[PDB]
Amino acid sequence: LESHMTPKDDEFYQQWQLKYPKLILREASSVSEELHKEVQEAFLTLHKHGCLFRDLVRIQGKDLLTPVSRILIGNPGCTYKYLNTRLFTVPWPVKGSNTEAEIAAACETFLKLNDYLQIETIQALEELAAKEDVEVDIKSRAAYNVTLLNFMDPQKMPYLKEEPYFGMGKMAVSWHHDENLVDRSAVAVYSYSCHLEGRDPDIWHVGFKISWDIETPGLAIPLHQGDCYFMLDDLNATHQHCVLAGSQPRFSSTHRVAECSTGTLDYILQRCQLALQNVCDDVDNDDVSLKSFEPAVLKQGEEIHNEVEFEWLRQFWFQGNRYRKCTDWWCQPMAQLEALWKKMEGVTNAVLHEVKREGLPVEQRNEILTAILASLTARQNLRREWHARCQSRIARTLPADQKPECRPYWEKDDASMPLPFDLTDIVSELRGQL
Numbered sequence: 511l512e513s514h515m516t517p518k519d520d521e522f523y524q525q526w527q528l529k530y531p532k533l534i535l536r537e538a539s540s541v542s543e544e545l546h547k548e549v550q551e552a553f554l555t556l557h558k559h560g561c562l563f564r565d566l567v568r569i570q571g572k573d574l575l576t577p578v579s580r581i582l583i584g585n586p587g588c589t590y591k592y593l594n595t596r597l598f599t600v601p602w603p604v605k606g607s608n609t610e611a612e613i614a615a616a617c618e619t620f621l622k623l624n625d626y627l628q629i630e631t632i633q634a635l636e637e638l639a640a641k642e643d644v645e646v647d648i649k650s651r652a653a654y655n656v657t658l659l660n661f662m663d664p665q666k667m668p669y670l671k672e673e674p675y676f677g678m679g680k681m682a683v684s685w686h687h688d689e690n691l692v693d694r695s696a697v698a699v700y701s702y703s704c705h706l707e708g709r710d711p712d713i714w715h716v717g718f719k720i721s722w723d724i725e726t727p728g729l730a731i732p733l734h735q736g737d738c739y740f741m742l743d744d745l746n747a748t749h750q751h752c753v754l755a756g757s758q759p760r761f762s763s764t765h766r767v768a769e770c771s772t773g774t775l776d777y778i779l780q781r782c783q784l785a786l787q788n789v790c791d792d793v794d795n796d797d798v799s800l801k802s803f804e805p806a807v808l809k810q811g812e813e814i815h816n817e818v819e820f821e822w823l824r825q826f827w828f829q830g831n832r833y834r835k836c837t838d839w840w841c842q843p844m845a846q847l848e849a850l851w852k853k854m855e856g857v858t859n860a861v862l863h864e865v866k867r868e869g870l871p872v873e874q875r876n877e878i879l880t881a882i883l884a885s886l887t888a889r890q891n892l893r894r895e896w897h898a899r900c901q902s903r904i905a906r907t908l909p910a911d912q913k914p915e916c917r918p919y920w921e922k923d924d925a926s927m928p929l930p931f932d933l934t935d936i937v938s939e940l941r942g943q944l
């Protein structure tokens with residue numbers, strides 16, 4: 511028989527205390543009724559403005575539309591990958607300064623909730639540490655830089671997946687870990703919902719289990735309006751969690767310390783400047799001359815080229831639906847990244863030209879090809895993948911306002927670009943020689 515534990519079961523409590531001590535529940539009553547109202551109306555305002563979107567993600571070769579709609583709010587310039595989709599932050603008013611009045615206010619509210627949750631988390635880590643620069647690690651692991659807001663109306667689904675192991679019933683989100691977070695970083699969630707036998711089907715729960723293990727009955731924790739739960743230290747890594755759907759719609763705010771060593775605007779702009787150091791930079795024109803044709807430098811250049819194109823430009827524009835409707839903060843940055851990428855397209859063309867030059871020893875010519883082939887290979891492959899995703903039946907189903915864009919994209923007819931979109935010819939020709 512497939513079973514789970516709820517607050518009804520006598521054993522729920524010892525299981526929580528003994529097996530899940532890094533799981534904290536702070537009930538609505540513990541949070542000011544003031545913060546509750548401001549946060550809940552912020553949810554409603556974001557919702558009314560149509561700021562939350564479902565995503566057309568890709569999982570194990572599968573194009574799938576997320577039942578849950580979401581928006582990422584957080585530090586200016588920061589990003590967070592979710593299901594292989596790079597979500598771009600709608601900035602909250604962290605010091606420094608930058609949106610439609612109401613949206614800006616709501617972001618300020620979620621920054622406010624962030625401060626609160628952060629302090630609460632530090633509190634819990636300290637009490638957890640006091641159970642047996644360690645303070646640096648504590649603050650470090652509670653320094654939420656992003657929140658992912660989610661919404662689902664279960665009524666809008668024709669059928670929900672059954673929780674497969676413990677008889678927990680309908681799942682809004684199946685068993686997983688929160689990914690791409692700083693090591694051992696906490697996660698804080700603010701949940702906003704509106705005879706027995708097991709967990710109450712009409713009430714939203716968060717479910718927990720130990721990874722690899724379906725022997726130990728999972729925990730189903732009820733989440734009433736305004737309840738908050740925290741995953742501390744290594745809990746998110748050692749355990750899986752799911753969201754069990756109730757009967758009414760529900761929002762949540764999920765504060766995280768996103769790992770961002772390669773996920774900020776500042777970072778990717780620096781990468782671009784690094785690549786462009788191999789380019790004579792007197793004037794911005796169609797004439798691109800390179801300072802060096804050394805293999806190591808050309809390799810790095812084409813890799814950065816790939817990074818900006820696929821991890822940034824493609825990711826952003828595929829999000830057909832989004833920020834022109836919540837921010838436009840990434841407007842200018844994305845125009846700038848594309849112009850940077852544009853110059854790099856000229857860089858590739860200069861390399862290809864040098865590979866052609868009549869007076870170049872086959873030695874140096876092979877060192878160049880052996881250096882850049884792996885990059886131009888991925889460029890071709892990734893370009894096919896991304897083009898297909900924009901044309902999937904699933905994609906052409908979406909309304910006009912959403913439907914993914916394949917930027918940047920151009921036809922041969924176009925002579926503002928130096929190289930073709932399809933490189934298979936150029937790529938094969940390079941391999942043949944080598």
Ligand SMILES: O=C(Nc1cc(Cl)c(O)cc1O)C1(c2ccccc2)CCC1
Nearest residue numbers: 569574575576577670671681682683684
């Ligand atoms: O959430 C998803 N699918 C889904 C889940 C539940 Cl729980 C449900 O009740 C109904 C659903 O359509 C996606 C998914 C997420 C991760 C891996 C595989 C698929 C499909 C796009 C997100």
Ligand SMILES: O=C(O)CCC(=O)C(=O)O
Nearest residue numbers: 578660683699753762764
């Ligand atoms: O909503 C929660 O309680 C956790 C976050 C979640 O399920 C999600 O990633 O959509």
Ligand SMILES: [Cl-]
Nearest residue numbers: 529530531532
């Ligand atoms: Cl634990």
Ligand SMILES: [Cl-]
Nearest residue numbers: 554557704759
């Ligand atoms: Cl609603």
Ligand SMILES: [Cl-]
Nearest residue numbers: 586587775776
């Ligand atoms: Cl920034």
Ligand SMILES: [Cl-]
Nearest residue numbers: 635638639743
């Ligand atoms: Cl600890």
Ligand SMILES: [Cl-]
Nearest residue numbers: 604653654655
């Ligand atoms: Cl912060």
Ligand SMILES: [Cl-]
Nearest residue numbers: 703704759760
């Ligand atoms: Cl609601």
Ligand SMILES: [Cl-]
Nearest residue numbers: 721722747748
């Ligand atoms: Cl694991």
Ligand SMILES: [Cl-]
Nearest residue numbers: 687688746747
């Ligand atoms: Cl993990």
Ligand SMILES: [Cl-]
Nearest residue numbers: 794849850853
């Ligand atoms: Cl430039």
Ligand SMILES: [Fe+2]
Nearest residue numbers: 683751752753
């Ligand atoms: Fe989740």
